[PDB]
Amino acid sequence: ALLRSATYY
Amino acid sequence: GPHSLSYSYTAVSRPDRGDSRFFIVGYVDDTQFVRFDSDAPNAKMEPRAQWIQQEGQEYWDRETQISKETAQNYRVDLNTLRGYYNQSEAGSRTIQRVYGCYLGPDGLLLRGYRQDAYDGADYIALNEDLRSWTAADMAAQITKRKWEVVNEAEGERSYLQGRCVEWLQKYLVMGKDTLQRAEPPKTHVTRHPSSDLGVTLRCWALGFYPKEISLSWQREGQDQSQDMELVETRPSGDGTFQKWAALVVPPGEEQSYTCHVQHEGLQEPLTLRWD
Amino acid sequence: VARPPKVQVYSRHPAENGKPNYLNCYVSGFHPPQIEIDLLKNGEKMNAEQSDLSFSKDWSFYLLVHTEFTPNAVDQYSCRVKHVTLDKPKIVKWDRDH
């Protein structure tokens, strides 16, 4: 299952 | 070897078409089991191994949702890294990302990892302590400082120590008869003439899993790795692999040369010879 | 950073005339990921499928293009690949011994 992390570079 | 669950992200910009494309592949060890492609007709996370197919729509809806959110973020991340490097807007560019967990004997995290790349070059990576980052340059330091500010590492560490290993264990059970049992190579030797002073002898190993194998030729006990052509291991197309090892011998010595196969599916190491 | 594809052409099982098999064109070690792959039979494109784009530790991409086929003594197979890294398309003929 995927890691759920919306993070911007 | 210890089992691993990993995901590979690939984001590619298309400034011409104004959009971008996002790929995901999920692996347990050497075995692909899911995929996502934002360019697909109503794109969703899809099964790619038989044993993951039993999952309920709940699983698929979630992974699909996470895939599209992530694809969305990458559309701006592509544009951000372009700004960090003062690059033009004309050409297609690429960000890549791998992350994963190795399963320990105690059923806990053995090792978690994450590395990112920009245009085929290392950008930033999570350290083994899962609490800090290493940036490869100026641009990555900007990214690193942001991820420090909002404590991105803790989200990663919590995932890797918890959810990642737990789902891996579940996948190891779901596909036990393929992921957990070794599959020995079907082996044989072929012979191929040429000149008067040479005959090529080629040792085959087919349909093996896992990927790690050892092919070697010996001449009366003596290694011949010096002049042994060895192909890069390649996929059969059905979840297993192929590899061959060859060398040229004088047209009568065929019996003085022996191929040596080691693979964990084999009970004992093998020694083959031409017939 | 650009990297030309390594191409390997082969069958899933040992080529045996008449007995249906799988013709594989394994394209690897390339970058960027945009690529075009055709399988050929006596020189003409077919209807193939392919596994999903992935990459190795060195960040280079790989995928398998493959179609179900039936080997004989007549038919000549191959693989045609184009990439930004190639002057003209690369054509690699299938060799059942290698």
Numbering used by the authors:
A (entry chain C): 1 to 9
B (entry chain A): 1 to 275
C (entry chain B): 1 to 98
Paper excerpt:
The resolution of the SLA-2*HB01–As64–sβ2m crystal was 2.4 Å, also with two molecules in the asymmetric unit. However, the crystals of SLA-2*HB01–As64 showed no clear difference in peptide folding in the two conformations. For crystals of SLA-2*HB01–As64, the conformation is similar to the CM1 of the SLA-2*HB01–Hu64–sβ2m crystal, where P5-Ser also serves as an anchor amino acid. We found that the main difference existed in the P5 residue, because the P5 (Thr) in Hu64 can form hydrogen bonds with the residue 152 of SLA-2*HB01–Hu64–sβ2m-CM1, whereas the P5 (Ser) in As64 cannot form hydrogen bonds with any residues of SLA-2*HB01–As64–sβ2m. However, SLA-2*HB01–As64–sβ2m can form more van der Waals interactions than SLA-2*HB01–Hu64–sβ2m-CM1. In addition, although the P5 (Ser) in SLA-2*HB01–As64 could not form a hydrogen bond with Glu 152, van der Waals interactions occurred, which indicates that having a hydrophilic amino acid in P5 in SLA-2*HB01 crystals should favor interaction with Glu 152. The N and C termini both appeared to have more stable conformation in As64 than in Hu64-CM1, whereas the middle positions (P5 to P7) should also be more flexible in As64 than in Hu64-CM1. Because the N and C termini of peptides mainly determine the binding capacity with MHC class I molecules, it is speculated that As64 might be bound with SLA-2*HB01 in a slightly more stable way than Hu64 overall. Among the peptide groups, it was shown that As64 can induce the highest IFN-γ release, Hu64 the second, and then INT3, Ahu63, and Q10; meanwhile, the blank control and negative peptide control only displayed a very small number of SFCs. Regarding the potential of Hu64 and As64 as TCR epitopes, we speculate that As64 might be the more dominant epitope for binding to TCR, more strongly inducing CTL immunity because SLA-2*HB01–Hu64-CM1 and SLA-2*HB01–Hu64-CM2 exist in one crystal as two conformations of crystals.
Two parallel peptides, Hu64 and As64, from the O and Asia I serotypes, respectively, were both crystallized with SLA-2*HB01. The two peptides Hu64 and As64 are derived from residues 64–72 of the immunodominant antigen VP1 protein of the FMDV O and Asia 1 serotypes, respectively. The overall structure of SLA-2*HB01 retains the characteristics of MHC I molecules common in other mammals. Among these, the α1 and α2 domains form a typical peptide-binding groove, which contains two α-helices and eight β-sheets, and the Hu64 and As64 peptides are embedded in the groove.
